[PDB]
């Protein structure tokens, strides 16, 4: 979301603090396959930022 | 409150700046300026390089 | 009338040049 | 415990405990006002220049 | 003012009402130096046409409204749109504003000569601190609006 | 935590618009804060005190 | 909810413009071979 | 709004201290009761010089001239020329710049014109060999005072060029808790528009006092004659006790009047240098003000300096009180563990001052 992306950019420029990603609402997924794929995509995108 | 007074002053300033922003630029800020476009003998008063 | 305005412009220019000088 | 005088009243009235109150010390240069020269670039994700 | 090397970020909108969908972080940069004054200058070009041509020499009009303006700008470097360079030689007594100029090569009547010049610019002393905590809503602070 | 130390008598005599005296409690961080009063600090979204 | 757009998601940044043929090598080689036959017809 | 001060006392220190701090100050009641009240001519010129080497500073002096308002700007320095009134020598105006020069946007290159020596103010050799060496310990690597022309009183005519190439973020944190072992005694004896015989006679007089010592005595003879020798006859000596171990220097200086015996002045100055060494622990009394000020404006750290009880005099107290008034910093003194001597450790916590004027 914007607030997530917006906040990271502010942190990057103003001095990066420790950042820990916490994913929620994963129970809403109905397939295990799509859950794993979604986790993979978010993790890699999160890795690019931090 | 003092904050309200400061807010009023900023309202006055923002109105003035908005009027400046919408207003057409001065002659020196058109880029190409002709003798007719600008006031007569303006360049004498102004400092240019 | 016009000559007076020209005179006034000349005075203003002279004053500005003096201010530079 | 830090005590401040002449605080705006709206701060006391329009006080929301959710919003943090951050106090930060200032070095002498932070007090002075003047022209700041900076190297700036439009953010890559911002749509407009 | 601040110590040099201090990073900062910029935003055009902070109120929730105008958030829209786009990214709100507008600019990023590093303060390089702190001073009390600055000499930003803008390019200013004066435009005229020739009306009488003798090989290199030519007479130009509409640059200046009076010979007084010519006097300040004698020796000024000028050029055509074609790129032919020249000089403001001397103000003609009659008519006012007309002056003689010499150029490296002969110019055509259709061409347009221009004088390059620089006009000083000033920084606007506008300071509007954000005071969201003092407001009831605390999330609709609004300052000077964009030109658009 | 947040607390207003202004005397209620002053609030009624002059009115709510009067500026206030406020005390702030919390943990200090970073470089040590000088003990002597008069230090300049900035409270985000409020101003410099 | 202000979902992320494509630029944010893929984060492709600035890249040179690339012809569609690069997407599939087979098509690119097909076109190159046909062009070679046409050029041979001149030789 | 304004930190207030009374009288002309410590004017240069207060203005310089304000400039470093950036805190505006007010100085009032300057010579109110004197027949000629208000600000003196030379001490006007110092305000002009301060204005030249900075930008954005606002200086107001009252209609009656007994009150001054100073709102400091940034230190920018540059290249300039200053004409020093005859009432004071160049050392009067150079000395405050030693505080300010290393913390400028641009290198200080100031050409001073006027009298170059006096009985009451720092001489050229005092600055060259006595004061800048203290700065070099604090991190001012490159600094020089070039003597283009000497000018003796009352007609002066001298010319000196101050160049401070080194620009630093702040002074280093000092750690000097020992008595420097001073290894050799050097100095410069100079004279203008007179016979060389005087200078030689002075070196004799100083040598007589200093012959009993256990170290070197090598006093330079710098006889000035001709166009560059100034307009008036004059002669003086500066003797410097040097510690090559940590590059500490102790100096005494004086100049002679017409009709004074050159040998006696040499004897006195050599005797005075001997007084200073006894009264000192790590730095001389004439050097202590620079050291204390530099330590106050260091990184947010404590620097330790050993000071003899004899140095804790009237001047030291008023200096410290002025520092607290401007910077709120407190100088702490503790006894040394030794019993042979009675010296004290001065511990001063820095304020974290930094050079923000310099471009990066
Ligand atoms: N199913 C599900 N519901 C969740 C999950 N995390 C939060 N929720 C629900 O989301 C709602 C909001 O939870 P909150 O703890 O209030 O989150 P919040 O950040 O405080 O929300 P706001 O402060 O109101 O902006 C609650 O009803 C939770 O039950 C999750 O992983 N799964």
DSSP string spanning E47-68?
EEEEEEEETTEEEEESS-SSHH
- CA A3 to chain G, closest CA, distance in angstroms equals 8
Q: Pick from H246, H198, H239: which is nearest to H220 by CA? A: H239
* Residues H126 and H170 grouped into a single domain: yes
Beta-carbon separation of A2 and G9 below 8 A: no
* Residues H128 and H191 grouped into a single domain: no
| Contact (Cβ atoms closer than 8 angstroms) between residue H236 and residue H255 | yes
Touch between H and G (at least 3 CB pairs under 8 Å): no
The H or E element that residue B15 is part of is helix B2-22
Which of H274, H303, H333 is the last residue in one of the domains? H274
| Contact (Cβ atoms closer than 8 angstroms) between residue H285 and residue H126 | no
Going by the DSSP 8-state scheme, the letter that residue H109 receives in this structure is E
Residue H25 lies in a domain: yes
Q: How many CB atoms lie within 10 A of CB B43?
A: 25
* Residues H145 and H270 grouped into a single domain: no
| Contact (Cβ atoms closer than 8 angstroms) between residue F21 and residue E110 | no
- CA D37 to chain F, closest CA, distance in angstroms equals 23
Q: How many CB atoms lie within 10 A of CB H325?
A: 15
E29 in reach of chain H (CB within 8 A): no
Q: Are strands H74-75 and H54-55 parallel, antiparallel or unpaired?
A: antiparallel
Which pair of tokens denotes residue E45? 């070009």
The rounded distance, in Å, linking the Cα atoms of H188 and H211 is 17
The rounded distance, in Å, linking the Cα atoms of H206 and H212 is 11
| Contact (Cβ atoms closer than 8 angstroms) between residue E22 and residue D46 | yes
- CA C10 to chain B, closest CA, distance in angstroms equals 9
Compute, in angstroms, the gap from residue H217 CA to the centroid of ligand 1: 86
Residue H159 lies in a domain: yes
| Contact (Cβ atoms closer than 8 angstroms) between residue H118 and residue H255 | yes
- CA A46 to chain E, closest CA, distance in angstroms equals 18
| Contact (Cβ atoms closer than 8 angstroms) between residue B44 and residue E91 | no
- CA A22 to chain G, closest CA, distance in angstroms equals 18
Q: Which of E1, E2, E35, E38 to mutate to test the interface with H (most CBs of H within 10 A)?
A: E35
Task: Determine the structural domain holding residue H266 and report its residue range.
Answer: 178-274
| Contact (Cβ atoms closer than 8 angstroms) between residue D28 and residue H23 | yes
Question: Which H-chain residues 41-70 have CB contacts (< 8 A) with chain E?
Answer: 55-56
Residue H42 lies in a domain: yes
The rounded distance, in Å, linking the Cα atoms of H86 and E25 is 61
Which residues from E are below 8 Å from F when comparing CB atoms?
129-134
Q: Pick from H66, H297, H72: which is nearest to H172 by CA? A: H297
Its sign, for the CA torsion H201, H206, H208, H214, is negative
For residue E117, count CB atoms less than 10 angstroms from its CB and return exposed for 0-12, middle for 13-18, buried for 19 or more: buried
What is each CA distance from H214 to F13, H92, H217, H219, H279, in whole angstroms? 82, 35, 9, 16, 19
Q: Pick from H318, H157, H189: which is nearest to H255 by CA? A: H189
E19 Cβ contact list (under 8 Å, min separation 6): E13, G2
Beta-carbon separation of D4 and F33 below 8 A: no
Which of H274, H308, H334 is the last residue in one of the domains? H274
The rounded distance, in Å, linking the Cα atoms of H357 and H174 is 24
D9 contact residues in F (CB cutoff 8 A): 16-20
- In three state form, how does the secondary structure of chain D look? CEEEEEECHHHHHCCCCCCCCCEEECCHHHHCCCEEEEEEEECCCCCCC
> What b-and-e string marks burial along H227-241, b requiring 16 or more CB atoms within 10 Å of the CB?
eebbbbbbbbbbbbb
- Report H helices in chain H: 11-21, 41-52, 90-100, 124-126, 132-138, 196-210, 262-279, 288-296, 314-327
Residue of A27, A30, A42 to mutate, ligand 1, most atoms within 8 A of C-beta = A27
CATH of the domain at H140: 3.65.10.20
What angle, 0 to 180 degrees and rounded to 10, lies between the N-to-C axes of helices H11-21 and H288-296? 20
Compute, in angstroms, the gap from residue D19 CA to the centroid of ligand 1: 19
**Cross-strand partners of H234:** H192
Give the nearest ligand 1 atom to A28 CA. 1
The rounded distance, in Å, linking the Cα atoms of A15 and A8 is 10
* Residues H283 and H268 grouped into a single domain: no
Compute, in angstroms, the gap from residue D21 CA to the centroid of ligand 1: 25
**Cross-strand partners of E86:** E78, E103
| Contact (Cβ atoms closer than 8 angstroms) between residue H191 and residue H220 | no
Tally of structural domains, chain H: 2
Compute, in angstroms, the gap from residue H32 CA to the centroid of ligand 1: 74
* Residues H213 and H145 grouped into a single domain: no
* Rg of chain G on CA atoms, in Å: 19
Which of H246, H274, H302 is the last residue in one of the domains? H274
Residue of chain D with shortest Cα separation from B5: D8
* Residues H308 and H224 grouped into a single domain: no
* Residues H138 and H197 grouped into a single domain: no
- CA D26 to chain E, closest CA, distance in angstroms equals 10
Its sign, for the CA torsion H10, H13, H15, H17, is negative
For residue H340, count CB atoms less than 10 angstroms from its CB and return exposed for 0-12, middle for 13-18, buried for 19 or more: exposed
Beta-carbon separation of E133 and F47 below 8 A: no
Experimental structure resolution, Å:
3.8
Compute, in angstroms, the gap from residue A21 CA to the centroid of ligand 1: 16
The reply to whether omega before B34 is within 30° of 0 (cis) is: no
Touch between H and C (at least 3 CB pairs under 8 Å): no
The rounded distance, in Å, linking the Cα atoms of H329 and H300 is 11
CATH of the domain at H250: 3.30.360.20
* Residues H264 and H344 grouped into a single domain: no
D45 contact residues in G (CB cutoff 8 A): 7-8
* Residues H113 and H190 grouped into a single domain: no
What is each CA distance from F35 to H42, H57, H328, H354, in whole angstroms? 39, 29, 9, 21
The rounded distance, in Å, linking the Cα atoms of H329 and H349 is 7
Residue H360 lies in a domain: no
Compute, in angstroms, the gap from residue A25 CA to the centroid of ligand 1: 8
* Residues H194 and H337 grouped into a single domain: no
Going by the DSSP 8-state scheme, the letter that residue H309 receives in this structure is G
The H or E element that residue E79 is part of is strand E77-80
E34 in reach of chain H (CB within 8 A): yes
| Contact (Cβ atoms closer than 8 angstroms) between residue E4 and residue E33 | yes
Residue H131 lies in a domain: yes
The rounded distance, in Å, linking the Cα atoms of E29 and E10 is 8
The H or E element that residue H65 is part of is none
Between A and E, how many CB-CB pairs are < 8 A?
20
F43 in reach of chain D (CB within 8 A): yes
What angle, 0 to 180 degrees and rounded to 10, lies between the N-to-C axes of helices H314-327 and H288-296? 20
Residue of A4, A7, A25, A35 to mutate, ligand 1, most atoms within 8 A of C-beta = A25
Residue of chain B with shortest Cα separation from E43: B31
Nearest to H359 among E32, E36, E37 (CB): E32
Compute, in angstroms, the gap from residue A27 CA to the centroid of ligand 1: 13
Whether A44 is in the pocket of ligand 1, judged by its Cβ within 6 Å, is: no
Residue H326 lies in a domain: yes
The set of long-range contacts for A26-34, using a CB threshold of 8 Å and a minimum separation of 24, is none
Q: How many CB atoms lie within 10 A of CB H94?
A: 24
Strand order across the beta sheet in which H248-255 lies: H216-224, H184-192, H234-243, H248-255
Ligand 1, atom 9: closest residue by C-alpha: A25
* Residues H135 and H68 grouped into a single domain: yes
Ligand 1, atom 30: closest residue by C-alpha: A25
For residue B31, count CB atoms less than 10 angstroms from its CB and return exposed for 0-12, middle for 13-18, buried for 19 or more: exposed
Backbone angles phi, psi at E20, to 5 degrees: 65, -145
| Region of residue B40 (left: phi > 0; alpha: psi -120 to 50; beta: else) | beta
Whether A1 is in the pocket of ligand 1, judged by its Cβ within 6 Å, is: no
| Contact (Cβ atoms closer than 8 angstroms) between residue H11 and residue H43 | yes
Q: Which of A45, A47, A48, A50 to mutate to test the interface with G (most CBs of G within 10 A)?
A: A45
The rounded distance, in Å, linking the Cα atoms of E39 and H360 is 19
Give the nearest ligand 1 atom to A24 CA. 31
The H or E element that residue H175 is part of is strand H175-176
Its sign, for the CA torsion B14, B19, B21, B26, is negative
Beta-carbon separation of A13 and E23 below 8 A: no
SS3 state of residue H332: strand
* Residues H267 and H290 grouped into a single domain: no
Residue H258 lies in a domain: yes
Q: How many CB atoms lie within 10 A of CB H121?
A: 17
């Amino acid at each position: 979301e914007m607030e997530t992306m917006e906040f990271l950019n502010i942190a990057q420029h103003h001095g990066m603090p420790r950042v820990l990603g916490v994913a929620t609402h994963l129970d809403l997924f109905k397939s295990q396959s799509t859950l794993r794929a979604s986790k993979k995509r978010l993790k890699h995108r999160f890795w690019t930022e931090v | 409150s003092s904050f309200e007074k400061q807010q009023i002053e900023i309202r006055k300033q923002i109105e003035q700046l908005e009027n400046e922003a919408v207003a057409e630029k001065k002659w020196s800020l058109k880029g190409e300026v002709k003798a007719k476009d600008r006031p007569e003998d303006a360049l004498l008063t102004e400092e240019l390089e | 009338t016009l000559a007076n305005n020209v005179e006034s412009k000349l005075r203003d220019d002279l004053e500005r040049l003096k201010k530079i000088r | 415990r830090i005590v401040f005088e002449k605080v705006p009243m709206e701060f006391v009235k329009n006080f929301n405990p959710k919003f943090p109150i951050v106090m930060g010390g200032l070095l002498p240069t932070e007090i002075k006002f003047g022209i700041v020269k900076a190297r700036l670039r439009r953010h890559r994700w911002h749509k407009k220049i | 003012l601040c110590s040099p090397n201090t990073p900062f970020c910029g935003v055009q909108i902070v109120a929730n009402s105008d958030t829209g969908n786009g990214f709100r972080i507008a600019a990023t940069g590093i303060v390089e130096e702190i001073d009390v004054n600055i000499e930003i200058v803008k390019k200013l070009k004066l435009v005229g046409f020739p009306y009488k041509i003798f090989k290199n020499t030519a007479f130009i009009k509409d640059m200046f409204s009076s010979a007084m303006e010519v006097a300040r700008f004698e020796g000024a470097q000028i050029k055509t749109v074609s790129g032919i360079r020249g000089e403001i030689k001397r103000a003609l007594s009659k008519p006012e504003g007309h002056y003689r100029a010499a150029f490296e090569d002969k110019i055509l009547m259709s061409d347009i000569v221009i004088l390059r010049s620089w006009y000083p610019v000033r920084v606007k002393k506008f300071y509007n601190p954000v005071t969201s905590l003092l407001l009831k809503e605390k999330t609709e602070w609004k300052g000077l609006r964009l030109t658009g | 935590r947040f607390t207003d130390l202004t005397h209620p008598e002053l609030i009624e005599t002059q009115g709510l618009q009067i500026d206030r005296k406020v005390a702030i409690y919390g943990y200090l961080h970073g470089t040590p804060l000088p003990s002597a009063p008069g230090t300049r600090v900035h409270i985000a979204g409020v101003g410099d005190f | 909810k202000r979902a992320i757009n494509y630029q944010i998601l893929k984060n492709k940044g600035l890249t040179p413009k690339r012809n569609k043929d690069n997407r599939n090598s087979r098509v690119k080689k097909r076109k190159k071979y046909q062009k070679a036959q046409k050029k041979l017809k001149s030789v | 709004k304004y930190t207030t001060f009374q009288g002309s006392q410590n004017f240069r220190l207060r203005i310089v201290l304000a400039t470093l701090s950036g805190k505006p100050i007010k100085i009032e009641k300057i010579r109110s009761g004197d027949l000629n009240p208000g600000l003196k001519d030379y001490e006007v010129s110092f305000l002009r010089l301060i204005e030249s080497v900075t930008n954005g500073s606002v200086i107001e002096i009252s209609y009656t001239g007994t009150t001054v308002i100073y709102r400091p700007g940034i230190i920018v320095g540059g290249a300039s020329t200053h004409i020093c009134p005859s009432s004071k020598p160049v050392g009067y105006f150079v000395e405050p710049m030693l505080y300010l020069a290393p913390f400028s946007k641009k290198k200080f290159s100031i050409l001073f014109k006027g009298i170059t020596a006096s009985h009451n103010d720092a001489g050229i050799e005092a600055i060259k060999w006595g004061l800048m060496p203290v700065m070099e310990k604090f991190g001012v690597r490159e600094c020089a005072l070039h003597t283009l022309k000497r000018g003796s009183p009352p007609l002066g005519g001298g010319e000196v060029h101050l160049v401070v190439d080194s620009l630093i973020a702040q002074p280093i944190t000092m750690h000097e808790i020992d008595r420097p072992i001073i290894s050799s005694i050097t100095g410069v004896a100079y004279s203008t528009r007179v016979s060389p015989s005087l200078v030689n006679r002075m070196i004799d007089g100083a040598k007589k006092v200093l012959k009993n010592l256990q170290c070197e005595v090598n006093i330079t003879a710098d006889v000035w004659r001709g166009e560059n020798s100034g307009k008036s006859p004059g002669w003086g000596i500066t003797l410097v006790a040097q510690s090559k171990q940590k590059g500490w220097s102790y100096f005494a200086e004086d100049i002679g009047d017409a009709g004074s015996i050159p040998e006696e002045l040499g004897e006195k100055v050599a005797c005075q240098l001997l007084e200073e060494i006894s009264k000192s622990a790590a730095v001389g009394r004439n050097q202590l003000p620079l050291a204390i000020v530099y330590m106050v404006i260091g990184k947010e750290d404590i620097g330790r300096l050993r000071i003899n009880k004899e140095q804790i005099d009237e001047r030291f107290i008023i200096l410290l009180r002025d520092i607290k008034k401007i910077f709120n910093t407190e100088v702490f003194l503790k006894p040394v563990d030794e019993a042979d001597n009675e010296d004290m450790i001065a511990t001063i916590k820095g304020i974290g001052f930094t050079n923000t004027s310099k471009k990066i």
